[PDB]
Design a binder for these strands. Structure first.
Lengths: 72, 124, 138
RNA sequence: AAUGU
RNA sequence: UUCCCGGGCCUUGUACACACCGCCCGUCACGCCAUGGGAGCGGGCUCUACCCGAAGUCGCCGGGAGCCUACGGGCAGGCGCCGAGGGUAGGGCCCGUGACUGGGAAGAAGUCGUAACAAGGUAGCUGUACCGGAAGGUGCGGCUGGA
RNA sequence: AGCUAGUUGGUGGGGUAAUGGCCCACCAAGGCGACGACGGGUAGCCGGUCUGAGAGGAUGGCCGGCCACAGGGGCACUGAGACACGGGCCCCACUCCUACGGGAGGCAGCAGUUAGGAAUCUUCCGCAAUGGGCGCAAGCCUGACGGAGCGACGCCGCUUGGAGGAAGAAGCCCUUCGGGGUGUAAACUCCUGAACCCGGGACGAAACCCCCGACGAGGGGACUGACGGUACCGGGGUAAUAGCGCCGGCCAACUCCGUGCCAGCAGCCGCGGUAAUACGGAGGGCGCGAGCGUUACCCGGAUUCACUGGGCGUAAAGGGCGUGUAGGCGGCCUGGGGCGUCCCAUGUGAAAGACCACGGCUCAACCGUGGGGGAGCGUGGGAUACGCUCAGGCUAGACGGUGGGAGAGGGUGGUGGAAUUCCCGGAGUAGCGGUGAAAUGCGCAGAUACCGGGAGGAACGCCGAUGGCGAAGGCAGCCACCUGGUCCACCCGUGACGCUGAGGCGCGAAAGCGUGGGGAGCAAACCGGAUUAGAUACCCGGGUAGUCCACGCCCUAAACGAUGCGCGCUAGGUCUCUGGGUCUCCUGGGGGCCGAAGCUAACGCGUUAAGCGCGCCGCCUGGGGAGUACGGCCGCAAGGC
């Protein structure tokens, strides 16, 4: 199910997305999927804000005492 | 309560509910698959858990988990149900025993195999 | 109306000693004396004497304690740390000689009533009789 | 004078 | 120095604690799970009444009827009570199932407000009654687990 | 929650081996049930077995004992015995033979098939032994049984090897590139010799029988072995299987890379978001070993149904309160009985099992022998402290008498003033009312404000609280009547007459409901005006039920001290209501506040206990779903239980 499926984009179109992707932290995300006139699976990509830092609450007393014990 | 009261009524003996009615309390139980799905977990975890609606011999149509990485279960395969909930996916209370009937062991697996169907890989 | 006479007595002793009272009274009962007679014999109480409160006959128990102590809370430790009724009117308790209790490994007594009179758990064990476990004291 | 993935 | 913004110190309330930019309630929309009701259908078990009733035991007869006799009788046979089972009808408890429907829980950044928690901005909660998209509001009375 | 008509009993029968409603006539109206009948669900019962410190809990597979059945169901025949597993009659279902009219059959015996299921074995060998049946006997039959077979299904034993052997090969893994680890592990040297080949080879078996003697006792002789040429013994003899679980915490065992809330783990908490000791592999480590893990089920942990051994002010948990039935519990002294209780003796407690001692297979697992416990229950004798019972006595509980007392305790009949509204009448003029500010509204049709009269309803200011009364709900002008409770004093009378209380009965704020009445003020619903984004609200102007009365319902609540009732025992202090006193002070009853001891998770409680005890009732065993549904009772309904 999860496969590194390859996409098809014009050479000049592909380089423009590489310029933006390598340079900055902007993602390319599947915006949607469908089938065009000809009847081919055609995916619509988007430009990403990225960011969205995932807050991770931390340090459980238990560990803290734990380390103190052993280290010293 | 007074000792007299205990003589009159007596203590209510426990009685516990079966975490798993795999009927006749048999160890495992065979059953067919009606729907082989992908479900999204509770609130902290994210993923696409591979569970499969199975219709056991004992008339129950229950949901069951499919362990390992990858499977070969079809919208109508013969499976053997084990028993073990999944604190993550709601009404899912039985694990599907990998390596029996249509449920294939795990390809490439090499560690805790006994519990994943896969036989001992010859060191070729 | 006072439901359990003995239980009352054993309890007065308790409460009483609990506040280092020199002595307290208890409604006179011939049976109760027999108990006290044993409490005395084993030196749990200095002793006791038959007396009168407005014509009504009582028993005066002269409590006993340990010596005063050092440190905060100088109160002396009791000789009667624990006194508890076993067989109550709501649930009488009986023991055959072979089932008579062993109180505090021995440093405690277990007064009971057998058809041979009111004896301790030894006096009783040594006599061959069991009966209605009255209470245990230690 | 309301609400806050 | 009332007011607006920021801040000391003490005290107070708190269902907050990544701490009020906090917490949190009910309907509504969608999807899924179990369950109640539901015109009724499909069963299982059991009960009662009556009709037909094998075998067989027992009870009569055993004669215009055969067979054995040591003619007292006996067997065959005839009849009857009882009777497994079947048939009809009506009840009972339980189970499955049903268009549709009531509420319930879960679901993920859905839609509407904001009732509660700090006088939560009208103290709150409560029995009851009425009312309203929804939380809820209001009357009467009660509690303090409020001033 | 009621059940019952052969139902319960009786007289006489029928029947059997025998009692009996087992069956039948007849007579009577009985029998059973909250100490749980009837009905429903589940289930073969015990010895034991697993677990457990134990008391308990769970279980009844193997082996022993009892019961029941033999395809579903009925019936008898025979017989010492059956209403008969491989006997019979009949109906039913099903399969099979047929010349279609009637025949044969029942594996829940052994072995085997198929179906069902996660899953459960050879169409075997032998009657040698043990046991059975028949027979004088030889002997026949015995899928009982003694064995072999298959399955790590379980327990015990056994092996894959033993002594050497490097600053430490290679490979692999990590590295602060020195080096660390796997690792004495291996290769390597010796060494022993599972297996396998060879040779010997069981005990189990000594009898029935025959002979002598009388076929008795005794003595002598003879045959017989399925397992098996197996166990075992002797000779020789090759180093000759290792897997599985786990390594974040509970829990013993850490590093590199891959992946990037994906893939996945998971028993709980929880890991996974680009250095993951938690996912996947590898290296390494830990545990265990022909096994290791998973799943299900029981006990444990869980004093988490608590007897041992729990609780109920705020955590779940006091019934809304009385009266009281059954029941449970009961003061002081004496005597009888001796039921509970205790003691001794004795019978029973089958075997096996468990415990212990000693032996048999090389150990053990197993197995043999002997020994000790064992509740319970029967019988016999004894004891009389406590419980019970009968009797005699007592007055310390309780109740009664005399005398005082306080009180918004209750029910009925009246009646007193202040206030609101309305009407009538004076007088009087431009506003009144209302809010945060307004407006709707009312007012020049003469309101608001002011004086007098009248009508009518409801509630009773000050006193008056921190007070009083009541079982609770609750009760407030005054007067009279009828009436309950409660306190004190004197210690006069009765003599344990007591405590509690499943059901039962009655009382039960407010709202609400039915008739009829009443209706001044207030006010859900409703209508306006504002506010606001909206305002089905808060604020303002109106306004109907209802709030009031009578009678009858409803039966709930933060019906709260969120604290059941009674009794006894544990410092004091201070205020207060009410009574007695040799009223400087002591004493009884009630209501508050602080605080000995003690209790409590803490807050707090504390002689008005949440302390220390006893009796009895009620109630709680995680949050939600739910005080919901179903059932039932109750209710007019709402709704209650």
């Amino acid at each position: 199910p999860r496969r590194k499926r390859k996409l098809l984009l014009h050479k000049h179109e592909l380089r423009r997305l590489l310029g933006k992707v390598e340079q900055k932290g902007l993602t390319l995300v599947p915006l949607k999927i469908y089938f065009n006139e000809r009847g081919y699976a055609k995916v619509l990509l988007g430009l990403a804000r990225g960011k969205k830092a995932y807050e991770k609450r931390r340090e459980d007393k238990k560990e803290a005492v734990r380390r103190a014990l052993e280290e010293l | 309560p007074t000792i007299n009261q205990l003589v009159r009524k007596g203590r209510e003996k426990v009685r516990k509910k079966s975490k798993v009615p795999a009927l006749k309390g048999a160890p495992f139980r065979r059953g067919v698959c009606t729907v082989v799905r992908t479900v999204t977990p509770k609130k902290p975890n994210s993923a696409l858990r591979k569970v499969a609606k199975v219709r056991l011999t004992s008339g129950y149509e229950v949901t069951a988990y499919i362990p390992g990485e990858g499977h070969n279960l079809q919208e109508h395969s013969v499976v053997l149900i084990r028993g073990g909930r999944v604190k993550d996916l709601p009404g899912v209370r039985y694990h599907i025993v990998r390596g029996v009937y249509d449920a294939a062991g795990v390809k490439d697996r090499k560690k805790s195999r006994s519990k994943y169907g896969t036989k001992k890989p010859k060191e070729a | 109306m006072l439901t359990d006479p003995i239980a009352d007595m054993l309890t007065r002793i308790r409460n009483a000693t609990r506040v280092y009272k020199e002595s307290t009274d208890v409604p006179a009962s011939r049976f109760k004396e027999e108990i006290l007679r044993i409490l005395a014999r084993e030196g749990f109480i200095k002793g006791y004497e038959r007396v009168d409160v407005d014509g009504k006959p009582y028993l005066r128990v002269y409590l006993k304690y340990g010596p005063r102590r050092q440190g905060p809370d100088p109160r002396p430790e009791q000789v009667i740390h624990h006194i508890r009724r076993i067989s109550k009117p709501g649930r009488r308790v009986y023991v055959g000689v072979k089932e008579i209790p062993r109180v505090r490994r021995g440093l405690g007594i277990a007064i009971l009533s057998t058809s041979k009179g009111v004896l301790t758990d030894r006096e009783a064990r040594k006599l061959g009789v069991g009966g209605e476990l009255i209470c245990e004291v230690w």
